[PDB]
Each structure stands twice: as C-alpha cells, then as structure tokens.
Design a protein around this ligand. Structure first.
Ligand code: C5P
Ligand code: C5P
Ligand code: KDO
Ligand code: KDO
Ligand code: NA
Ligand code: NA
Ligand code: NA
Ligand code: NA
Lengths: 394, 394
C-alpha cells in the first residue's frame, strides 16, 4: 500500500505540523496505510493543551473534507515513529537555527535521517515489500535517497494553488518534487503539440471559480506577500524575502503606486504609514485592483497569470513556466495543461485507487480524462478540455 | 580634513538613506569637509515630493541636534558624487535583489566601486592630500581597500545603542568596523586589568538613564524583533531573521510564556492571535517584564545585559563580548569600558577636534577622560569612572 511520510520535526515551533494531512489520509483510507511520522501526531488529540488547534475546528474539517479519527479508524494502519534525538542533533548542526535546519531537511541528504528511516522500514515483517509507493508532503532528499535504494517511487503531494471557497479544491502530485524542482514544465513540453484549446485564460480561470467574481482606482503595482517561514520561502525563493521583494518593487515604483497585500496566514501585518495596504476580502479582489503583480512564489501568482495580469515571479514554482512563454496561444495551452493535467482534484490525491492509477505513469490523455470525470461528477486531450469548458459555458 | 562617505544607493528603496548624518556633519562643521555621496543628497530638500521625510521634522532635528542647511552652509564644502549606473549594474550582478546587493556592499570588495572612488578622489587638486581620515557610516570593504592604497584610516561611525529620550545620546566610532567586525572586545582585552569599578551594572545603566525608570506579571521569555532590512540583520545576523529568532525561542518556550516586541521602526507589526504582544511605551519597560531576553543583535540586548537579565545574543554585535564573560566582576568592568571608552558621546563623533583627537590613537585613559568631561559639562581610569558614578550618586 501507501507509505505516507509526515515528519514530526517542529521546525516552525508547532508540533505535528502536518496533522491535517494525517487526518485526511485516515478519513479517506480504504486499505491499510503505513504512516512514517511521530508520536506527536498520535497524542495531539487527547492533549487538552492543544484542543484549540485549527485542525479541530469544524469549519476547517468541512473545508478540507475530513473528520477526526477514532480508536477504530487508526487501528487498521501501521505506524513508524521518528525520535526527537535526531532533531535536537540536527539543530545543533545548523547553529540551532530551526529554519536553516528546515532548509537542509528540504534540500540536502541527512545520513542520520536515512539511517533511522532504513531502520524503521526494516524493523518489521515485509513492511518494505508491502510498499507500493512513498508519499511525501514536501521534498526530502533523505527519504528520496532511501527510496532509490529500495526501488520505490516518491509522490510529492500537497494542497494546490486553487482552493475553496474561491475555487474547486486542487492538489499537487509530482514525482520529482513539490513546489521546488517540479516536473510540470517537463510534462507540458512533451505534449504541447497536443493542445489546441479554444478558450481564453479567463475561461480556464472561470472553470475553476466556484463564486461569482468580485465587483470589477487601480494601483500600478501589487505586491503579494507570503508566510515568512513557509517551505517555499525558505528553500525555493532564490534568497528573496517579503522585505527584499518590497525593495525590488520600490526600485521600479514610488510608494504611492504600490499596493501591498500581506498573507492572511502570516504572523505579521503591515503598518499603514508607508505603503497603501490592501484590505480586500480575497486575493482575487486584490489583484483585480493592480495593473501588474509581483510575487516570489505565491499561489496568487497563478491567479494573476490566469486573469491576464503582467506578473513577475522571482522564486521557483510549479506554474512559472506558463509565464515564460511568448505568445498568447502557447500560454493558454500551457495553462490548460497545468490546470487539467498537472493539478489534481483535491480529494483524489488521498484516494488509493487514483494513486495506484498515477503509479502506472499513464498517458496525459488518461490523466486529463480522470480529472474531468471527477470535476464533472454531474476524444483527444483538447477535445476533452474544450468540451468540459463548453459544457460549463451553457 | 574629513572625507565623509554617504553612499546614495537606495538599497532599501529610499533615496539619500543617510541624509540625517549629512545634515549633522554640515551643522557641526567647523572646517571644510569632503563629502563623497550622491546628487540625491544635494537635491532632496528643494524636492516638494520628499518634504514629508522624517529628517525634516522639527522634533527629529531637535532630538539629533541639527538644523537644515542653507546655501551658505554648504558652499564651504567639497562634494564628490557617485553615479547610479554602477548601482543598476550592481543589482544586475545579484539577481536584481537590492538586499543581497546591500549585503555585498557591506561585506565584499566591489572593484567597479573602488575604481569610481579612486577616480573621484583623483579628479581634482590635492583632494587626497587634504584627507586626514575617511569616515564611513557602515562597513565598506570597497572604501577600506581604497583607503589602504592611499594610506588613510577609516572611522566607522553611527548612532549608538543608547539614545534619547531614554538615555544620553551615544555613538559608535570604530576603526575596524561598526556593528560587525568591531574592535570593542580587542580594546577591552588590552586594558581589562586597569578596571576595578566599584559600581554595579545597574549603576552603569543609571548613569546613562535620563528618565526615571518605569514602574517596575512577568513573561518567562522576551523576544526583541528588529527592522527587517537593517544592515546588521542583513550582514551580521549569522543568517538569523525575526521569524527564525521566533522559532528559536519556541523550541525552548511554549507560546504562552513568550512576550514579543516588534521594532517600532519596522514596516511589520504582529498579529494578536498567536503570541502575547508587547505594548510597552519603551524597550526598557518591555525587558523589565521578562525573565530572560532573546535578540539577534538589537541595541536592546545591551539594555537587557545592563539590567541584569539573562540575555541570548545570536548575531554579531559590539556588546556581545560583555555577555560572554564569566563572573560578575569582569562583566561590570567590561560594561564600564564599553560604556565610557568604546561608546562616544553622540555629538563628539561630529566634532572635528574630537575626531582629530581619536585619529592620534590616544590611550584608553585619555579617551575616557574626554568622554567624562563631556558627560560632566556641569587619576587612573577606574578613578575617573568611579568618581563620575559617585558624583552622579549624590
Ligand atoms: N498575499 C496573499 C497570499 C496568499 N493569499 C491566499 O492564500 C492562498 C495560498 O497562497 P500562498 O501560496 O501564497 O500561501 C491563496 O490562494 C490566496 O487565497 C492571500 O489572500 N494574500
Ligand atoms: N524590539 C525593539 C527594538 C528596538 N527598540 C528601540 O529602538 C532602539 C534601537 O534598537 P535596534 O538596534 O534594535 O534598532 C532601541 O534603543 C530601543 O529604544 C524597541 O523599542 N523595540
Ligand atoms: O506548508 C508550507 O510550508 C507552505 C507550502 C506551500 O505549498 C503552501 O501550501 C503554503 C500555504 O499556502 C500556507 O498557507 O504553505
Ligand atoms: O541603519 C541601519 O542599517 C541599522 C544600523 C544599526 O546600527 C541601527 O542604527 C539600526 C537602527 O536602530 C534602526 O532604527 O539601523
Ligand atoms: Na508551486
Ligand atoms: Na466555475
Ligand atoms: Na552593534
Ligand atoms: Na543618569
């Protein structure tokens, strides 16, 4: 079955950092799953000191589509637990900087981590033989090195750039890496000639919109800020930060022409003294007020591209290649492939039958057909997409 | 005379970034000064688009002790102007990141910058021969390399860690570097045996206090945040940031025991959702509520040390060596030397007669005597300091 890697290391000061994906896989589980995680994941619940975490909020559970697991739900899976001694040692090897330690976890092999993973996997039965694929919610060269030795693939899976309530929920599934080192551009290059999409970028954007767009005083430049310690601002940012992104824009625009939107999930908000601060209810209403958008690698950059805004992308990300194409035609085709073939309907990356489907490395046409079938729960590759858009049209 | 280096490069998006020091040297000038700067410094005034800058606020002028220069005041100095073409080229050589470019300016030689400096200095008269010393408000290996070739010293000068209205105004003057690569520890090591201070750390703190201390619900841990793009968070931080500093503390304390104070000058403030946020009127009232303090390299770390608080200093800074001494005795002696001999009364670093004094590299006893004479505008080195403290006592 699946071997789901959810490391317990509190790089950003939060225990069980990926608890929500632990609950989601448990909720959707149809067969037994091997969880490679930490005891923090198994004890967080019956810890009255953490009962206020957002993962326990009924609104968050309903939005992500999971329910809290019970004793029975968990008893049907196998659990391997990583110890904290390695984490303490890791911090001591990077000058006690937890963020730099996180960066090494995301971008370098850690031999001591590989040793413990091998030991855990070799600790029982034919655990290794039962493994059809690894799943990791982030890049992890330690795990990926172990996977090569054992002949297993690594699916990198995470929530996608389009999310409810504004959009249909999407997710990433990438065999090379998630956010950084992605294979979206490589997949597109191989089937680019198979795309003749009779729709505009706005039509593709409209297909994923679940709401009526906001009410269409422009700012010349909009600046998207991100969560300061998110993995793709730590590892895939090309050294840019929120503050150097702001300086970058101020080299090109006077502060009176800049509109800044802080990430609603950041610990930091902006003072009103310097820039004009955005107070929009959503990121779409914000970029609509801007003539061009600047981002490191926020999901919002995709929104700007799909709405036809001049967009600068300074960091590595899965959608950047769409922005690097000359000519409207190729850009629409690249966006269509990205949205219907690279992105996955959110629930499907937690579906074991779908994961087995992707493990066979099927053709892009079959992948698109699976996604549209799901989106359309109510022929060439372009025919599938053109007809899907057209049926949504009327 | 003096050759004052005030570069015009808007690394942080602000033109004439050190305009206030330009006005201060002009205001206190008794002789002709050579200014190596940019045209932005000379035109900012009669630019109605910048008349709201804080350097023009009468309260800021009175606090820093300068008045706006007029046509006559400036006509008695010589001006060399750096061009912007180099800045544009510099940005293109660091992936258009202005903050990374700033870092290179602070920490690396830039041959093209050295060439332009040499050309400017060689552009007229015996400009070079009239130069008694360079003054730089930041570390600049480009300028320091030029200085070596020409046989000139470089005084690194900046506002100090103790400032009005809470304290007597102080400044740095350091021949090796300011903030980073400082010589405070080296100077202390040479005369440590000459210090037998009959006062406590609180007594030294009281000497520089100009106000009555605040009214003495403790938090186990206080976190000092800094301005995100200040030079000593860009170049001398050992890679730490505000966000990794927070994670560092969260590895040791639960959020309920952490009190966070954002820098009043930062563009960012903190949300109320996670940590307990400090709303003190000053940094002293904040650290008084904490049992131990954490900082990268804020001036506030010195305050914590002088008030006897357990202090963690993660970045490079001039006062760190005080915190690395074992035993209360040596710590008080180190603090006394730092405060009376390393730190300079603010006005004196703009006084040409005092600068000439320091250019002779006098003995630590003479330096302390000059500073106490200034502080006391109303004998061994320890006798000078002990008597100064005692006279302030009664
Ligand atoms: N500056 C920002 C960044 C993100 N966001 C919201 O957060 C979601 C994910 O964004 P990141 O990839 O930037 O975390 C986006 O779809 C958008 O809904 C926002 O509203 N403003
Ligand atoms: N978190 C912080 C940082 C600085 N400060 C104020 O700013 C002045 C200089 O601090 P930095 O060296 O941190 O810029 C300090 O003396 C203190 O008065 C504050 O009040 N809170
Ligand atoms: O979880 C993270 O480290 C990050 C990964 C990004 O792909 C993205 O999911 C981001 C979220 O948008 C944070 O809200 O967090
Ligand atoms: O000006 C800077 O880059 C910095 C230097 C520090 O020594 C310190 O002066 C700091 C100020 O406290 C910022 O308010 O700014
Ligand atoms: Na991405
Ligand atoms: Na739609
Ligand atoms: Na310092
Ligand atoms: Na005093």
């Amino acid at each position: 079955g699946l071997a789901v890697f959810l490391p317990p290391y509190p790089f950003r000061g939060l225990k069980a950092p990926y608890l929500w994906m632990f609950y989601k896989y448990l909720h959707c589980a149809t067969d037994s799953i091997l969880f490679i995680t930490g005891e923090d994941y198994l004890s967080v619940t019956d810890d009255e000191a953490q009962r206020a975490r957002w993962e326990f909020d009924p609104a968050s559970m309903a939005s992500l589509g999971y329910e809290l697991p019970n004793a029975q739900s968990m008893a049907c899976h196998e659990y391997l637990t990583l110890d904290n001694a390695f984490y303490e040692t890791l911090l001591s090897r990077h000058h006690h900087d937890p963020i730099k330690s996180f960066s090494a976890f995301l971008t370098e092999r850690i031999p001591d981590l590989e040793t413990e993973l091998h030991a855990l996997l070799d600790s029982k039965k034919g655990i290794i033989d039962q493994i059809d694929t690894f799943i990791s919610i982030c890049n992890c060269p330690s795990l990926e090195h172990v996977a090569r030795t054992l002949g297993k693939e690594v699916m990198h899976i995470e929530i996608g750039p389009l999310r409810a309530p504004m959009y249909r929920n999407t997710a990433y599934l990438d065999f090379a890496g998630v956010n950084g080192g992605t294979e979206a551009s490589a997949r597109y290059e191989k089937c680019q000639a198979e795309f003749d999409i009779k729709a505009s970028l706005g039509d593709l954007h409209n297909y994923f919109l679940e709401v009526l767009p906001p009410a269409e005083t422009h700012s010349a430049a909009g600046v998207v800020l991100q969560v300061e310690d998110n993995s793709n601002l730590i590892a895939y940012n090309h050294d840019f930060t929120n503050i150097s992104l702001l300086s970058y824009v101020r080299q090109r625009y006077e502060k009176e022409d800049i509109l800044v939107r802080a990430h609603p999930g950041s610990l930091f908000r902006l003072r009103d003294d310097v820039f004009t601060i955005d107070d929009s209810a959503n990121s779409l209403a914000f970029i609509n007020q801007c003539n061009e958008v600047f981002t490191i690698n926020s999901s919002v950059g995709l929104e700007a591209i799909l709405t036809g805004k001049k967009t600068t992308v300074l960091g590595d990300c899965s959608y950047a290649f769409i922005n690097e194409l000359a000519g409207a035609s190729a850009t629409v085709n690249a966006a269509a492939f990205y949205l219907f073939s690279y992105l996955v309907p959110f629930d499907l990356v937690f579906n074991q039958e779908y994961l087995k489907f992707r493990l066979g490395h099927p053709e892009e046409r079959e992948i698109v057909g699976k996604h549209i079938e799901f989106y359309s729960a109510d022929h060439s590759l372009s025919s599938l997409i053109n007809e899907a858009i057209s049926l949504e049209h009327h």
